């Protein structure tokens, strides 16, 4: 069921940012890990004398990467005069985000109608303002509030290219690198407590829950069109293997985003482009699972693929899951960085056409039950 | 000439470590755009819950990545019980030093005969102490004393791979990466004023000045067998065009490393296969000297470069410079990171053969002239 209680207008994800100690390298190496272009630039020279901050785009789906300079650049600076292009921006917010939590996301921004009346409309119902509104060159509005940790829910509005005082890159160093990703799918927080961080949410946006159908119990959130679709997840203690939400609560000092799940239009050759490149500055797999989840895909999904296409998920290592109403193939890396934290997942979902609905084939859980008789499975082999 | 005062055995540059907010990334970045290989580690996986530190090499080459953990997962440790690899590692330190300089490099590191001798012998002779001789697993002695900024001078002593506690990278992790660098040539300094940095420097390490034949004043401090070269600059203040020293120390937040200068042995290869990657990853090179500079090469080192070598030089964008003694060809990158500091140089010397000595050819001063003369020439060819 669907009340559609949207409290705003939402349109889609906007984009996703992280806040880095050097902007450069991570955008770098994330852009040849990902098959994303470099698409903007806010920096020195662009006239901004506050942070560094790059765009990598792949179809819709957009990566920001943000540094800050040294404060004696902009030490004359006030906020009505700053150079800064993104005015929620704050040194000692960024160094105090980074020494705490590591590289990780800042923010998830979502397009929304009116960005001064989401944020209205949010902090009247519950939500903590982090920034408030305001409007970039009578083009666009930009507002925060907190949604986890320390990451915010970013709002933009766009009265009609990023953002004002963004430039686009020049073509030479803008490669036309694409792997096939093409949005973001999903964005999941990890917090110590899931009831108090839904009702929160949930309160002050009007997100419903998204139905469904180990170490974590989780819900999803959805908005109106179930198209942004923000996950959260606690974890369950005592369990005989620790919990991977304590382990990344314990390394990210507290909660945060947990992992980005972006979608392919290609799994199969997006998979096959990352995998190349995971030795040589991309990013690493988690171990595929064994031969005997993929002896146990035909029975699952023998008629959603062909025996060619279960193949090419076993030499990928892709998982598959369904539901009533879709089928999902998807995969998950190791740690984006040095900590046991973040990570990203890539995904691609067959069925619900009408477009496709959002959630289409849910979000894998079903997988812990077929890994670890897959597993049991595997071992009886011997 | 060479008056041979070491006061202490130094035999060569070791190792170059960054500091950095995340190992991980900067290192990714580094080996894809520079074609070094992974080659150890000390991290989580290895025991250390303190700081992640990877190793990158190249040939001789030694870079080090490190950035620090969360001090929670260490708190209850102290220094007799440490798990960092690395005993001269400080959260505090580690975190001042990227947040006041960005992504730079924090230790010159120097192979000598005994660790605790050069350290002694150093400090008695005016160097400022910043780590102790620490003896690690009877096998190794790591100590540092400050050079310039906040940049170290590290020495390291072998009783007889590359630190204890770090381990050897798994074969499928470690992609045998290779453009063609071989070892650090030397490691350039910026300071505010350049007689008392050599004054000091020279004071307690016994390095005597190297011989040479814009916007600066340098001197090259030389070990016993030149092989260890560290020159340092200072700004020239007043030109028309502002000093690119100054700007240094000015988005630095003072002195420190300015460029790390790798020695190819094939410096056409390591151009060719740095530049397919400036764009998808890897680093981005200044702007090529105008086709007069090409042109002018012929009369200068026609006799060691036939012109089929002077135009690869031009399709690379490689610069030439001669001493009485040997030739030398280079190249600069772009800035490594967000900020206009430190950047790489790459460089292959020819003559001085006896195995080759160490500077031959110079630095590449003489191509300030050549630059701007070739540069007035290109605008009169209008
Ligand atoms: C626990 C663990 C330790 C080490 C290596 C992998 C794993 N591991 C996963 O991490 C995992 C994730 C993240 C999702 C997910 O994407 C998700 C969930 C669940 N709920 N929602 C809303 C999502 O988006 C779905 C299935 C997963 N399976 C089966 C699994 O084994
Ligand atoms: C100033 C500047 C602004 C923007 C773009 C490039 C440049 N630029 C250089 O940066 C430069 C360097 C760093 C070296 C060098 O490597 C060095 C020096 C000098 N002394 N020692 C001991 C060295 O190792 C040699 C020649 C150079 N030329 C000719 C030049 O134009
Ligand atoms: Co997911
Ligand atoms: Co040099």
């Not at 989840?293 to 369904?322: P, T």
């Amino acid at each position: 069921k669907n009340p559609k209680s949207d409290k705003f207008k939402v349109k889609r994800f906007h984009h996703i940012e992280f806040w880095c100690g050097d902007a450069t390298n991570v955008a770098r190496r994330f852009s040849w890990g990902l098959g994303m272009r470099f698409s903007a630039k806010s920096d020195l020279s662009t006239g901004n004398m506050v942070h560094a901050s790059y765009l990598l785009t792949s179809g819709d789906l957009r990566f920001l990467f943000t540094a800050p300079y040294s404060p004696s650049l902009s030490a004359g600076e006030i906020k009505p005069t700053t150079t800064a292009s993104i005015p929620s921006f704050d040194h000692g917010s960024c160094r105090s985000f980074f020494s705490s939590h590591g590289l990780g996301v800042r923010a998830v921004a979502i397009e929304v109608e009116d960005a001064e009346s989401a944020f209205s409309i949010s902090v009247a119902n519950g939500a903590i303002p982090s920034s408030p509104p305001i409007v970039l060159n009578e083009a666009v509005t930009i507002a925060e509030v907190k949604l986890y940790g320390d990451v915010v829910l970013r709002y933009v509005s766009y009265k009609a290219e990023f953002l004002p005082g963004f430039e686009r890159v020049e073509d030479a160093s803008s490669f036309p690198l694409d792997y096939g990703i093409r949005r973001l799918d999903h964005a999941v927080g990890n917090v110590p407590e899931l009831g108090p961080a839904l009702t929160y949410v949930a309160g002050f946006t009007g997100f419903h829950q998204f139905a469904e159908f180990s170490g974590l119990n989780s819900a999803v959130l959805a908005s109106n069109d179930e198209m942004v679709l923000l996950p959260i997840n606690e974890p369950v203690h005592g369990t005989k293997r620790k919990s991977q939400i304590q382990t990344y609560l314990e390394h990210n000092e507290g909660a945060g985003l947990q992992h980005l799940a972006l979608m392919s239009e290609d799994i199969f050759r997006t998979l096959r482009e990352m995998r190349k490149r995971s030795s040589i500055g991309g990013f690493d797999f988690m171990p595929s699972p064994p031969p005997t989840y993929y002896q146990n895909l035909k029975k699952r999904v023998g008629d959603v693929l062909s025996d060619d296409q279960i193949k090419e998920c076993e030499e990928l290592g892709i998982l598959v899951d369904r539901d009533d109403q879709g089928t999902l193939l998807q995969i998950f890396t190791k740690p984006l960085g040095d900590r046991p934290t973040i990570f990203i997942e890539i995904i691609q979902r067959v069925g619900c056409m009408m477009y496709q609905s959002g959630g289409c084939g849910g979000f894998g859980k079903g997988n812990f039950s077929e890994l670890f008789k897959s597993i049991e499975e595997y071992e009886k082999t011997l």
